[PDB]
Protein backbone atom coordinates (compact mmCIF):
# COMPACT_ATOMS: atom_id res chain seq x y z
CA UNK A 1 0.00 0.00 0.00
CA UNK A 2 1.14 3.63 -0.43
CA UNK A 3 3.55 5.05 2.15
CA UNK A 4 5.62 8.20 2.51
CA UNK A 5 4.34 9.79 -0.69
CA UNK A 6 1.91 11.96 -2.49
CA UNK A 7 -0.43 10.03 -4.75
CA UNK A 8 -2.30 11.62 -7.64
CA UNK A 9 -5.27 10.09 -9.50
CA UNK A 10 -6.59 11.60 -12.69
CA UNK A 11 -10.30 11.10 -11.89
CA UNK A 12 -11.38 12.61 -15.14
CA UNK A 13 -9.64 13.89 -18.23
CA UNK A 14 -12.50 14.88 -20.57
CA UNK A 15 -14.01 18.11 -21.89
CA UNK A 16 -17.30 19.50 -20.54
CA UNK A 17 -19.68 17.04 -22.30
CA UNK A 18 -17.39 14.02 -21.62
CA UNK A 19 -16.27 11.46 -24.16
CA UNK A 20 -18.49 10.25 -25.76
CA UNK A 21 -20.97 13.11 -25.60
CA UNK A 22 -24.40 12.26 -24.13
CA UNK A 23 -25.65 11.54 -27.71
CA UNK A 24 -23.04 8.79 -28.20
CA UNK A 25 -20.68 10.97 -30.28
CA UNK A 26 -17.09 9.72 -29.91
CA UNK A 27 -15.73 12.21 -32.44
CA UNK A 28 -12.39 10.89 -33.69
CA UNK A 29 -11.81 8.72 -30.64
CA UNK A 30 -11.59 4.97 -31.04
CA UNK A 31 -14.66 3.75 -29.15
CA UNK A 32 -13.00 0.37 -28.60
CA UNK A 33 -10.17 1.86 -26.46
CA UNK A 34 -11.43 2.23 -22.87
CA UNK A 35 -8.95 5.10 -22.35
CA UNK A 36 -11.05 7.28 -24.62
CA UNK A 37 -14.07 7.05 -22.30
CA UNK A 38 -13.64 10.32 -20.38
CA UNK A 39 -15.35 11.68 -17.32
CA UNK A 40 -15.28 15.42 -16.50
CA UNK A 41 -11.99 16.93 -15.33
CA UNK A 42 -10.94 16.31 -11.75
CA UNK A 43 -7.82 15.38 -9.80
CA UNK A 44 -7.46 13.44 -6.54
CA UNK A 45 -4.51 14.48 -4.30
CA UNK A 46 -3.38 12.29 -1.40
CA UNK A 47 -0.62 12.31 1.13
CA UNK A 48 0.38 9.07 2.84
CA UNK A 49 2.56 8.89 5.94
CA UNK A 50 4.83 6.04 7.09
CA UNK A 51 1.92 3.97 8.37
CA UNK A 52 -0.32 4.52 5.35
CA UNK A 53 -2.60 7.10 6.98
CA UNK A 54 -3.87 9.51 4.27
CA UNK A 55 -4.93 13.12 3.78
CA UNK A 56 -7.31 13.30 0.78
CA UNK A 57 -8.19 16.36 -1.25
CA UNK A 58 -10.19 16.52 -4.47
CA UNK A 59 -9.81 19.23 -7.12
CA UNK A 60 -13.30 19.97 -8.50
CA UNK A 61 -16.54 18.06 -7.96
CA UNK A 62 -18.16 17.75 -11.37
CA UNK A 63 -21.11 15.52 -12.27
CA UNK A 64 -18.83 12.47 -12.34
CA UNK A 65 -17.58 13.02 -8.80
CA UNK A 66 -19.49 10.17 -7.15
CA UNK A 67 -18.31 7.49 -9.64
CA UNK A 68 -14.83 8.96 -9.69
CA UNK A 69 -14.49 8.56 -5.93
CA UNK A 70 -16.10 5.08 -5.87
CA UNK A 71 -13.76 3.88 -8.64
CA UNK A 72 -10.75 5.47 -6.98
CA UNK A 73 -11.11 3.05 -4.04
CA UNK A 74 -10.51 5.98 -1.67
CA UNK A 75 -13.46 6.14 0.75
CA UNK A 76 -12.74 9.28 2.77
CA UNK A 77 -12.26 12.97 1.96
CA UNK A 78 -10.74 15.92 3.88
CA UNK A 79 -11.44 18.81 1.51
CA UNK A 80 -12.52 19.95 -1.99
CA UNK A 81 -10.57 22.66 -3.87
CA UNK A 82 -12.14 24.44 -6.86
CA UNK A 83 -10.60 25.77 -10.06
CA UNK A 84 -13.56 27.86 -11.38
CA UNK A 85 -17.40 27.75 -11.43
CA UNK A 86 -18.27 25.97 -14.63
CA UNK A 87 -20.86 23.12 -14.65
CA UNK A 88 -18.37 20.37 -15.41
CA UNK A 89 -16.35 21.31 -12.29
CA UNK A 90 -19.04 21.95 -9.70
CA UNK A 91 -22.38 20.21 -10.40
CA UNK A 92 -21.51 17.09 -8.35
CA UNK A 93 -21.17 19.20 -5.19
CA UNK A 94 -24.20 17.68 -3.44
CA UNK A 95 -22.39 14.36 -3.30
CA UNK A 96 -20.03 15.77 -0.66
CA UNK A 97 -22.90 15.14 1.82
CA UNK A 98 -21.93 11.54 2.71
CA UNK A 99 -18.47 12.60 3.95
CA UNK A 100 -19.99 15.28 6.20
CA UNK A 101 -21.87 12.52 7.96
CA UNK A 102 -18.72 10.29 8.13
CA UNK A 103 -16.42 13.07 9.38
CA UNK A 104 -18.96 14.60 11.81
CA UNK A 105 -17.92 17.98 10.51
CA UNK A 106 -18.84 20.30 7.62
CA UNK A 107 -16.81 19.63 4.47
CA UNK A 108 -14.07 22.23 4.07
CA UNK A 109 -14.17 23.69 0.58
CA UNK A 110 -11.65 26.11 -0.96
CA UNK A 111 -12.48 28.62 -3.66
CA UNK A 112 -11.65 32.11 -4.86
CA UNK A 113 -14.22 34.94 -4.54
CA UNK A 114 -15.52 34.48 -8.10
CA UNK A 115 -16.08 30.72 -7.60
CA UNK A 116 -17.40 31.07 -4.06
CA UNK A 117 -19.96 33.74 -4.98
CA UNK A 118 -21.28 31.53 -7.89
CA UNK A 119 -21.50 28.45 -5.58
CA UNK A 120 -23.49 30.58 -3.09
CA UNK A 121 -25.90 31.56 -5.86
CA UNK A 122 -26.51 28.18 -7.27
CA UNK A 123 -25.94 25.86 -4.29
CA UNK A 124 -26.97 28.11 -1.38
CA UNK A 125 -28.61 25.22 0.45
CA UNK A 126 -25.14 23.64 0.88
CA UNK A 127 -24.09 26.68 2.97
CA UNK A 128 -27.31 27.85 4.64
CA UNK A 129 -30.71 26.23 5.25
CA UNK A 130 -33.29 28.12 3.11
CA UNK A 131 -36.79 29.10 4.13
CA UNK A 132 -39.08 26.03 4.29
CA UNK A 133 -36.28 23.41 4.61
CA UNK A 134 -34.91 21.20 7.36
CA UNK A 135 -31.68 20.20 5.59
CA UNK A 136 -28.61 21.38 7.52
CA UNK A 137 -25.76 22.95 5.55
CA UNK A 138 -22.90 20.67 4.51
CA UNK A 139 -19.99 22.99 3.52
CA UNK A 140 -17.50 25.22 5.25
CA UNK A 141 -15.96 27.81 2.93
CA UNK A 142 -12.32 28.94 2.87
CA UNK A 143 -10.91 31.69 0.63
CA UNK A 144 -8.05 31.06 -1.73
CA UNK A 145 -6.33 33.47 -4.10
CA UNK A 146 -3.51 33.36 -6.63
CA UNK A 147 0.01 33.53 -5.17
CA UNK A 148 -1.13 32.75 -1.61
CA UNK A 149 -0.18 29.23 -0.60
CA UNK A 150 -2.61 27.27 1.60
CA UNK A 151 -2.38 23.95 3.38
CA UNK A 152 -4.97 21.28 4.09
CA UNK A 153 -4.45 19.14 7.22
CA UNK A 154 -5.32 15.50 7.67
CA UNK A 155 -4.33 12.05 8.89
CA UNK A 156 -1.44 11.82 6.40
CA UNK A 157 -0.01 15.26 7.26
CA UNK A 158 -0.51 18.57 5.51
CA UNK A 159 -0.83 19.07 1.76
CA UNK A 160 0.39 22.46 0.62
CA UNK A 161 -1.16 24.00 -2.52
CA UNK A 162 0.29 26.99 -4.42
CA UNK A 163 -2.61 28.51 -6.39
CA UNK A 164 -2.03 30.81 -9.36
CA UNK A 165 -3.98 32.74 -11.95
CA UNK A 166 -4.95 31.38 -15.37
CA UNK A 167 -6.84 33.07 -18.18
CA UNK A 168 -9.83 30.92 -19.25
CA UNK A 169 -11.51 32.78 -22.10
CA UNK A 170 -13.68 35.46 -20.50
CA UNK A 171 -13.03 34.35 -16.92
CA UNK A 172 -10.14 33.46 -14.61
CA UNK A 173 -9.46 29.91 -13.43
CA UNK A 174 -6.99 28.68 -10.85
CA UNK A 175 -4.08 26.30 -11.36
CA UNK A 176 -2.25 24.65 -8.47
CA UNK A 177 1.21 23.37 -7.72
CA UNK A 178 1.44 20.58 -5.14
CA UNK A 179 5.12 19.89 -4.55
CA UNK A 180 6.51 19.36 -8.06
CA UNK A 181 3.20 18.28 -9.57
CA UNK A 182 1.25 21.09 -11.34
CA UNK A 183 -2.42 21.00 -12.38
CA UNK A 184 -3.52 23.46 -15.11
CA UNK A 185 -7.01 22.76 -16.55
CA UNK A 186 -9.34 25.24 -18.26
CA UNK A 187 -6.64 27.61 -19.37
CA UNK A 188 -6.21 29.57 -22.60
CA UNK A 189 -3.25 31.76 -21.46
CA UNK A 190 -0.83 31.98 -18.58
CA UNK A 191 -0.19 35.39 -17.05
CA UNK A 192 3.49 36.31 -16.59
CA UNK A 193 3.27 36.15 -12.77
CA UNK A 194 2.05 32.54 -12.88
CA UNK A 195 5.11 31.20 -14.74
CA UNK A 196 7.15 30.57 -11.60
CA UNK A 197 4.56 28.06 -10.43
CA UNK A 198 4.41 26.13 -13.72
CA UNK A 199 8.06 25.86 -14.76
CA UNK A 200 10.37 22.91 -13.95
CA UNK A 201 7.57 20.63 -12.74
CA UNK A 202 8.27 16.91 -12.29
CA UNK A 203 4.73 16.32 -13.68
CA UNK A 204 2.75 19.03 -15.55
CA UNK A 205 -0.93 18.14 -16.04
CA UNK A 206 -2.12 20.61 -18.63
CA UNK A 207 -5.33 21.07 -20.59
CA UNK A 208 -5.34 20.49 -24.34
CA UNK A 209 -8.89 20.55 -25.68
CA UNK A 210 -8.63 19.71 -29.39
CA UNK A 211 -6.55 20.47 -32.51
CA UNK A 212 -8.36 23.61 -33.65
CA UNK A 213 -8.25 26.89 -31.72
CA UNK A 214 -10.84 27.52 -29.03
CA UNK A 215 -11.35 30.70 -27.09
CA UNK A 216 -11.25 29.09 -23.64
CA UNK A 217 -8.64 26.34 -23.91
CA UNK A 218 -5.25 25.58 -25.33
CA UNK A 219 -5.19 23.56 -28.50
CA UNK A 220 -2.84 20.58 -28.56
CA UNK A 221 -0.28 22.70 -30.47
CA UNK A 222 -0.47 25.50 -27.88
CA UNK A 223 -0.16 23.04 -25.01
CA UNK A 224 2.93 21.51 -26.56
CA UNK A 225 4.43 25.03 -27.12
CA UNK A 226 3.96 25.66 -23.41
CA UNK A 227 5.45 22.27 -22.46
CA UNK A 228 8.60 23.06 -24.54
CA UNK A 229 8.94 26.38 -22.70
CA UNK A 230 8.27 25.07 -19.15
CA UNK A 231 10.43 21.90 -19.37
CA UNK A 232 8.39 19.53 -17.21
CA UNK A 233 10.03 16.14 -16.75
CA UNK A 234 6.71 14.56 -17.77
CA UNK A 235 3.53 16.15 -19.08
CA UNK A 236 0.01 14.69 -19.02
CA UNK A 237 -2.71 16.21 -21.18
CA UNK A 238 -6.20 16.68 -19.75
CA UNK A 239 -9.63 18.22 -20.51
CA UNK A 240 -9.42 16.45 -23.88
CA UNK A 241 -12.43 16.68 -26.18
CA UNK A 242 -13.74 14.18 -28.79
CA UNK A 243 -11.28 15.18 -31.54
CA UNK A 244 -8.36 13.88 -29.50
CA UNK A 245 -7.96 10.05 -29.73
CA UNK A 246 -5.64 8.45 -27.15
CA UNK A 247 -3.43 6.38 -29.44
CA UNK A 248 -3.28 9.16 -32.02
CA UNK A 249 -2.27 11.91 -29.53
CA UNK A 250 0.25 9.50 -27.96
CA UNK A 251 2.06 9.29 -31.37
CA UNK A 252 1.80 13.03 -32.10
CA UNK A 253 3.47 14.12 -28.94
CA UNK A 254 7.05 13.92 -27.54
CA UNK A 255 8.14 10.91 -25.47
CA UNK A 256 7.82 12.76 -22.15
CA UNK A 257 4.31 13.94 -23.03
CA UNK A 258 1.11 11.78 -22.98
CA UNK A 259 -2.67 12.10 -23.15
CA UNK A 260 -4.13 11.30 -19.76
CA UNK A 261 -6.78 8.66 -19.13
CA UNK A 262 -9.31 8.25 -16.34
CA UNK A 263 -7.73 6.39 -13.42
CA UNK A 264 -4.14 7.35 -14.39
CA UNK A 265 -2.33 7.18 -11.03
CA UNK A 266 1.18 7.94 -9.75
CA UNK A 267 3.11 8.44 -6.57
CA UNK A 268 5.89 10.95 -5.92
CA UNK A 269 8.18 11.70 -3.01
CA UNK A 270 6.92 14.24 -0.45
CA UNK B 1 -36.63 -2.85 -33.19
CA UNK B 2 -39.51 -1.19 -31.29
CA UNK B 3 -42.67 -0.34 -33.25
CA UNK B 4 -46.16 0.84 -32.40
CA UNK B 5 -45.51 1.15 -28.68
CA UNK B 6 -44.45 3.14 -25.71
CA UNK B 7 -41.12 2.07 -24.29
CA UNK B 8 -40.03 2.84 -20.74
CA UNK B 9 -36.47 2.57 -19.39
CA UNK B 10 -35.73 2.84 -15.70
CA UNK B 11 -32.55 4.94 -16.06
CA UNK B 12 -32.00 5.05 -12.36
CA UNK B 13 -33.66 3.52 -9.34
CA UNK B 14 -31.51 4.69 -6.40
CA UNK B 15 -31.87 7.13 -3.51
CA UNK B 16 -30.16 10.55 -3.52
CA UNK B 17 -26.58 9.36 -2.78
CA UNK B 18 -26.88 6.33 -5.13
CA UNK B 19 -25.97 2.76 -4.29
CA UNK B 20 -23.24 2.41 -3.13
CA UNK B 21 -22.83 5.83 -1.54
CA UNK B 22 -19.78 7.83 -2.70
CA UNK B 23 -17.80 6.35 0.28
CA UNK B 24 -18.34 2.79 -0.99
CA UNK B 25 -21.16 2.00 1.48
CA UNK B 26 -23.46 -0.68 0.02
CA UNK B 27 -25.56 -0.91 3.18
CA UNK B 28 -27.36 -4.25 3.14
CA UNK B 29 -27.10 -4.64 -0.63
CA UNK B 30 -25.14 -7.53 -2.07
CA UNK B 31 -22.24 -5.78 -3.81
CA UNK B 32 -21.81 -8.76 -6.13
CA UNK B 33 -25.28 -8.31 -7.73
CA UNK B 34 -25.01 -5.67 -10.48
CA UNK B 35 -28.71 -4.83 -9.97
CA UNK B 36 -27.85 -3.23 -6.65
CA UNK B 37 -25.62 -0.63 -8.31
CA UNK B 38 -28.08 2.28 -8.52
CA UNK B 39 -27.91 5.59 -10.28
CA UNK B 40 -30.17 8.52 -9.26
CA UNK B 41 -33.87 8.27 -10.08
CA UNK B 42 -34.94 8.93 -13.65
CA UNK B 43 -37.28 7.48 -16.26
CA UNK B 44 -36.99 7.47 -20.05
CA UNK B 45 -40.33 7.60 -21.97
CA UNK B 46 -40.48 6.82 -25.69
CA UNK B 47 -43.13 6.49 -28.31
CA UNK B 48 -42.42 4.50 -31.47
CA UNK B 49 -44.58 4.62 -34.59
CA UNK B 50 -45.02 1.93 -37.27
CA UNK B 51 -41.70 2.73 -38.90
CA UNK B 52 -39.70 2.94 -35.67
CA UNK B 53 -39.52 6.74 -35.54
CA UNK B 54 -39.41 7.84 -31.86
CA UNK B 55 -40.47 10.68 -29.57
CA UNK B 56 -38.17 10.72 -26.52
CA UNK B 57 -38.83 12.36 -23.18
CA UNK B 58 -36.80 12.07 -19.99
CA UNK B 59 -38.19 12.49 -16.48
CA UNK B 60 -35.54 14.29 -14.39
CA UNK B 61 -31.92 15.02 -15.26
CA UNK B 62 -29.89 14.11 -12.19
CA UNK B 63 -26.11 13.80 -11.99
CA UNK B 64 -26.27 10.40 -13.71
CA UNK B 65 -28.14 11.74 -16.73
CA UNK B 66 -25.25 11.62 -19.21
CA UNK B 67 -24.34 7.96 -18.47
CA UNK B 68 -28.00 7.01 -18.28
CA UNK B 69 -28.63 8.31 -21.79
CA UNK B 70 -25.39 6.84 -23.22
CA UNK B 71 -26.21 3.42 -21.73
CA UNK B 72 -29.81 3.61 -22.90
CA UNK B 73 -28.62 3.52 -26.54
CA UNK B 74 -31.11 6.32 -27.31
CA UNK B 75 -29.16 9.19 -28.89
CA UNK B 76 -31.80 11.90 -29.29
CA UNK B 77 -34.12 13.79 -26.93
CA UNK B 78 -37.29 15.87 -27.46
CA UNK B 79 -37.96 17.14 -23.93
CA UNK B 80 -37.17 16.88 -20.19
CA UNK B 81 -39.98 16.79 -17.59
CA UNK B 82 -39.22 17.49 -13.91
CA UNK B 83 -40.73 16.05 -10.74
CA UNK B 84 -39.27 18.50 -8.16
CA UNK B 85 -36.06 20.54 -7.58
CA UNK B 86 -33.86 18.30 -5.49
CA UNK B 87 -30.17 17.77 -6.40
CA UNK B 88 -30.56 14.14 -7.42
CA UNK B 89 -33.21 15.13 -10.00
CA UNK B 90 -31.76 18.28 -11.54
CA UNK B 91 -27.96 18.60 -11.24
CA UNK B 92 -27.26 16.94 -14.61
CA UNK B 93 -29.19 19.67 -16.43
CA UNK B 94 -26.14 21.13 -18.19
CA UNK B 95 -25.80 17.91 -20.14
CA UNK B 96 -28.92 18.81 -22.15
CA UNK B 97 -26.61 21.13 -24.15
CA UNK B 98 -25.53 18.53 -26.77
CA UNK B 99 -29.14 17.91 -27.88
CA UNK B 100 -29.73 21.65 -28.35
CA UNK B 101 -26.94 21.63 -30.89
CA UNK B 102 -28.30 18.42 -32.56
CA UNK B 103 -31.91 19.65 -32.70
CA UNK B 104 -31.06 23.24 -33.71
CA UNK B 105 -33.59 24.38 -31.15
CA UNK B 106 -33.68 25.13 -27.42
CA UNK B 107 -34.49 22.07 -25.30
CA UNK B 108 -38.11 22.15 -24.16
CA UNK B 109 -38.30 21.58 -20.42
CA UNK B 110 -41.46 21.12 -18.34
CA UNK B 111 -41.76 22.04 -14.69
CA UNK B 112 -44.19 23.42 -12.14
CA UNK B 113 -43.71 26.94 -10.69
CA UNK B 114 -41.84 25.68 -7.61
CA UNK B 115 -39.38 23.64 -9.72
CA UNK B 116 -39.05 26.27 -12.43
CA UNK B 117 -38.28 29.09 -9.99
CA UNK B 118 -35.54 26.95 -8.28
CA UNK B 119 -34.00 26.04 -11.70
CA UNK B 120 -33.94 29.77 -12.57
CA UNK B 121 -32.09 30.49 -9.33
CA UNK B 122 -29.49 27.84 -9.59
CA UNK B 123 -29.13 27.32 -13.35
CA UNK B 124 -29.99 30.80 -14.68
CA UNK B 125 -27.32 30.59 -17.37
CA UNK B 126 -29.35 27.78 -19.02
CA UNK B 127 -32.21 30.26 -19.57
CA UNK B 128 -30.49 33.63 -19.98
CA UNK B 129 -26.91 34.70 -20.75
CA UNK B 130 -25.52 36.43 -17.61
CA UNK B 131 -23.36 39.52 -17.50
CA UNK B 132 -19.81 38.75 -18.71
CA UNK B 133 -20.69 35.55 -20.66
CA UNK B 134 -21.01 34.56 -24.29
CA UNK B 135 -22.82 31.25 -23.72
CA UNK B 136 -26.28 31.25 -25.32
CA UNK B 137 -29.17 29.83 -23.31
CA UNK B 138 -30.09 26.19 -23.91
CA UNK B 139 -33.60 25.70 -22.41
CA UNK B 140 -37.15 26.66 -23.25
CA UNK B 141 -39.48 26.50 -20.26
CA UNK B 142 -43.07 25.23 -20.24
CA UNK B 143 -45.41 25.29 -17.22
CA UNK B 144 -47.04 22.16 -15.90
CA UNK B 145 -49.42 21.76 -12.98
CA UNK B 146 -51.27 18.93 -11.26
CA UNK B 147 -54.46 17.77 -12.99
CA UNK B 148 -53.64 19.54 -16.28
CA UNK B 149 -52.63 17.06 -18.96
CA UNK B 150 -49.89 18.10 -21.41
CA UNK B 151 -48.50 16.52 -24.55
CA UNK B 152 -45.02 16.46 -26.02
CA UNK B 153 -44.74 16.16 -29.82
CA UNK B 154 -42.07 14.35 -31.79
CA UNK B 155 -41.16 12.01 -34.62
CA UNK B 156 -43.01 9.07 -33.00
CA UNK B 157 -46.21 11.04 -32.36
CA UNK B 158 -47.38 12.78 -29.21
CA UNK B 159 -46.82 11.55 -25.66
CA UNK B 160 -49.52 12.67 -23.27
CA UNK B 161 -48.62 13.12 -19.58
CA UNK B 162 -51.17 13.47 -16.75
CA UNK B 163 -49.35 15.21 -13.88
CA UNK B 164 -50.64 15.08 -10.31
CA UNK B 165 -49.72 16.28 -6.85
CA UNK B 166 -47.64 14.27 -4.36
CA UNK B 167 -46.60 15.17 -0.83
CA UNK B 168 -42.81 14.86 -0.45
CA UNK B 169 -42.02 15.73 3.16
CA UNK B 170 -41.99 19.53 3.35
CA UNK B 171 -42.45 20.08 -0.38
CA UNK B 172 -44.68 18.94 -3.25
CA UNK B 173 -43.45 16.68 -6.04
CA UNK B 174 -45.18 15.66 -9.25
CA UNK B 175 -46.15 12.18 -10.37
CA UNK B 176 -47.17 11.38 -13.93
CA UNK B 177 -49.41 8.93 -15.72
CA UNK B 178 -48.44 8.09 -19.30
CA UNK B 179 -51.16 5.85 -20.71
CA UNK B 180 -51.46 3.07 -18.12
CA UNK B 181 -47.93 3.46 -16.80
CA UNK B 182 -47.61 5.65 -13.64
CA UNK B 183 -44.40 7.14 -12.21
CA UNK B 184 -44.45 8.16 -8.52
CA UNK B 185 -40.99 8.94 -7.06
CA UNK B 186 -40.20 11.14 -4.05
CA UNK B 187 -43.55 10.76 -2.38
CA UNK B 188 -44.50 10.35 1.28
CA UNK B 189 -48.31 10.74 0.85
CA UNK B 190 -50.85 10.90 -1.92
CA UNK B 191 -53.50 13.60 -1.76
CA UNK B 192 -57.09 12.41 -2.29
CA UNK B 193 -57.41 14.21 -5.66
CA UNK B 194 -54.39 12.35 -7.06
CA UNK B 195 -55.87 8.86 -6.54
CA UNK B 196 -57.67 8.77 -9.88
CA UNK B 197 -54.33 9.03 -11.68
CA UNK B 198 -52.64 6.25 -9.70
CA UNK B 199 -55.30 3.54 -9.48
CA UNK B 200 -55.68 0.61 -11.92
CA UNK B 201 -52.31 1.16 -13.61
CA UNK B 202 -50.89 -1.56 -15.85
CA UNK B 203 -47.46 -0.66 -14.37
CA UNK B 204 -47.05 1.43 -11.17
CA UNK B 205 -43.48 2.62 -10.60
CA UNK B 206 -43.47 3.78 -7.01
CA UNK B 207 -40.81 4.96 -4.59
CA UNK B 208 -39.89 2.81 -1.59
CA UNK B 209 -36.82 4.19 0.15
CA UNK B 210 -36.00 1.73 2.94
CA UNK B 211 -37.64 -0.35 5.70
CA UNK B 212 -37.73 2.27 8.43
CA UNK B 213 -39.94 5.36 8.27
CA UNK B 214 -38.59 8.50 6.62
CA UNK B 215 -40.23 11.88 6.50
CA UNK B 216 -39.95 12.33 2.73
CA UNK B 217 -40.51 8.87 1.28
CA UNK B 218 -42.64 5.79 1.64
CA UNK B 219 -41.08 2.89 3.44
CA UNK B 220 -41.34 -0.49 1.73
CA UNK B 221 -44.32 -1.35 3.99
CA UNK B 222 -46.11 1.89 3.08
CA UNK B 223 -45.44 1.37 -0.62
CA UNK B 224 -46.88 -2.12 -0.46
CA UNK B 225 -49.97 -0.79 1.44
CA UNK B 226 -50.51 1.63 -1.41
CA UNK B 227 -50.00 -1.09 -4.06
CA UNK B 228 -52.68 -3.26 -2.36
CA UNK B 229 -55.09 -0.30 -2.46
CA UNK B 230 -54.36 0.83 -6.06
CA UNK B 231 -54.33 -2.65 -7.69
CA UNK B 232 -51.68 -2.14 -10.36
CA UNK B 233 -51.21 -5.16 -12.60
CA UNK B 234 -47.47 -4.88 -11.95
CA UNK B 235 -45.55 -2.64 -9.57
CA UNK B 236 -41.86 -1.66 -9.76
CA UNK B 237 -40.15 -0.11 -6.75
CA UNK B 238 -37.79 2.82 -7.24
CA UNK B 239 -35.72 5.42 -5.33
CA UNK B 240 -34.39 2.51 -3.25
CA UNK B 241 -31.70 3.26 -0.68
CA UNK B 242 -28.84 1.06 0.62
CA UNK B 243 -30.98 -0.91 3.10
CA UNK B 244 -32.96 -2.47 0.27
CA UNK B 245 -31.13 -5.43 -1.39
CA UNK B 246 -32.53 -6.61 -4.74
CA UNK B 247 -32.83 -10.34 -4.06
CA UNK B 248 -34.10 -9.72 -0.53
CA UNK B 249 -36.85 -7.22 -1.57
CA UNK B 250 -37.80 -9.54 -4.45
CA UNK B 251 -38.65 -12.29 -1.86
CA UNK B 252 -40.40 -9.92 0.56
CA UNK B 253 -42.85 -8.62 -1.93
CA UNK B 254 -45.88 -10.09 -3.79
CA UNK B 255 -45.42 -11.79 -7.17
CA UNK B 256 -46.70 -8.79 -9.15
CA UNK B 257 -44.35 -6.43 -7.29
CA UNK B 258 -40.54 -6.12 -7.85
CA UNK B 259 -37.61 -3.88 -6.97
CA UNK B 260 -36.48 -2.04 -10.07
CA UNK B 261 -32.96 -2.09 -11.44
CA UNK B 262 -31.09 0.34 -13.67
CA UNK B 263 -31.79 -0.44 -17.32
CA UNK B 264 -35.11 -2.23 -16.59
CA UNK B 265 -37.02 -1.78 -19.87
CA UNK B 266 -40.51 -2.61 -21.18
CA UNK B 267 -42.84 -1.85 -24.00
CA UNK B 268 -46.61 -1.36 -23.82
CA UNK B 269 -49.35 -0.76 -26.35
CA UNK B 270 -50.13 2.88 -27.20
N1 LIG C 1 -22.68 30.81 -16.07
C1 LIG C 1 -22.31 29.51 -16.04
N2 LIG C 1 -22.21 28.83 -14.88
C2 LIG C 1 -21.85 27.52 -14.81
N3 LIG C 1 -21.56 26.76 -15.89
C3 LIG C 1 -21.61 27.34 -17.10
C4 LIG C 1 -21.99 28.74 -17.26
N4 LIG C 1 -21.97 29.02 -18.58
C5 LIG C 1 -21.63 27.88 -19.21
N5 LIG C 1 -21.41 26.90 -18.32
C6 LIG C 1 -21.01 25.51 -18.58
O1 LIG C 1 -19.63 25.43 -18.23
C7 LIG C 1 -18.99 24.52 -19.12
C8 LIG C 1 -17.93 25.29 -19.92
O2 LIG C 1 -16.99 24.29 -20.28
P1 LIG C 1 -15.40 24.47 -20.54
O3 LIG C 1 -15.34 24.39 -22.06
O4 LIG C 1 -14.77 23.19 -20.02
O5 LIG C 1 -14.87 25.80 -19.94
C9 LIG C 1 -20.10 23.90 -19.96
O6 LIG C 1 -20.63 22.82 -19.21
C10 LIG C 1 -21.12 25.01 -20.00
O7 LIG C 1 -22.43 24.54 -20.34
N1 LIG D 1 -32.73 23.41 -1.29
C1 LIG D 1 -32.31 22.32 -1.98
N2 LIG D 1 -32.20 22.33 -3.33
C2 LIG D 1 -31.77 21.27 -4.05
N3 LIG D 1 -31.42 20.08 -3.52
C3 LIG D 1 -31.52 19.94 -2.18
C4 LIG D 1 -31.97 21.04 -1.33
N4 LIG D 1 -31.93 20.60 -0.05
C5 LIG D 1 -31.48 19.34 -0.09
N5 LIG D 1 -31.25 18.96 -1.36
C6 LIG D 1 -30.76 17.66 -1.85
O1 LIG D 1 -31.90 17.00 -2.40
C7 LIG D 1 -31.79 15.60 -2.14
C8 LIG D 1 -32.95 15.17 -1.26
O2 LIG D 1 -33.12 13.79 -1.56
P1 LIG D 1 -34.47 12.91 -1.49
O3 LIG D 1 -34.25 12.11 -0.21
O4 LIG D 1 -34.36 11.92 -2.63
O5 LIG D 1 -35.73 13.81 -1.47
C9 LIG D 1 -30.40 15.40 -1.53
O6 LIG D 1 -29.49 15.30 -2.62
C10 LIG D 1 -30.18 16.71 -0.82
O7 LIG D 1 -28.79 16.96 -0.54
K1 LIG E 1 4.02 10.83 -26.56
K1 LIG F 1 -41.84 -10.07 -5.63
MN1 LIG G 1 -14.04 22.57 -18.02
MN1 LIG H 1 -14.39 25.91 -17.84
MN1 LIG I 1 -34.92 12.03 -4.78
MN1 LIG J 1 -36.52 14.60 -3.31
Relevant terms:
homodimer, 270 residues, alpha/beta, Metallo-beta-lactamase, Chain A, seven-stranded mixed beta sheet, 14 strands, 29% strand, globular, binds adenosine monophosphate, binds potassium ion, binds manganese (II) ion
Concise account of the structure shown:
Two copies of one chain form a homodimer. By secondary structure, chain A is α/β, with parallel strands linked by helices. Chain A has helices at 65-72, 87-90, 97-103, 113-122, 195-198, 220-230, 246-252, and strands at residues 5-12, 42-48, 54-59, 79-81, 107-111, 139-143, 150-152, 159-168, 171-178, 181-184, 203-207, 234-238, 257-259, 264-268.
The outline of chain A comes out as: globular
**Bound chemical compounds:** adenosine monophosphate, potassium ion, manganese (II) ion
As a percent range, the share of strand residues of chain A is 25-35%
Any idea what the radius of gyration of chain A is?
A: 18 Å
Counting structural domains of chain A, the number is: 1
What are the secondary-structure elements of chain A, in order, as H or E? EEEHEHHEHEEEEEHEHEHEE
* Neighbour order of strands in the largest sheet of chain A: 6-5-4-3-2-1-14
CATH architecture of chain A: 4-Layer Sandwich
Could you estimate the helical fraction of the residues of chain A in percent?
10-25%
Number of strands of chain A: 14
CATH superfamily of chain A: Ribonuclease Z/Hydroxyacylglutathione hydrolase-like
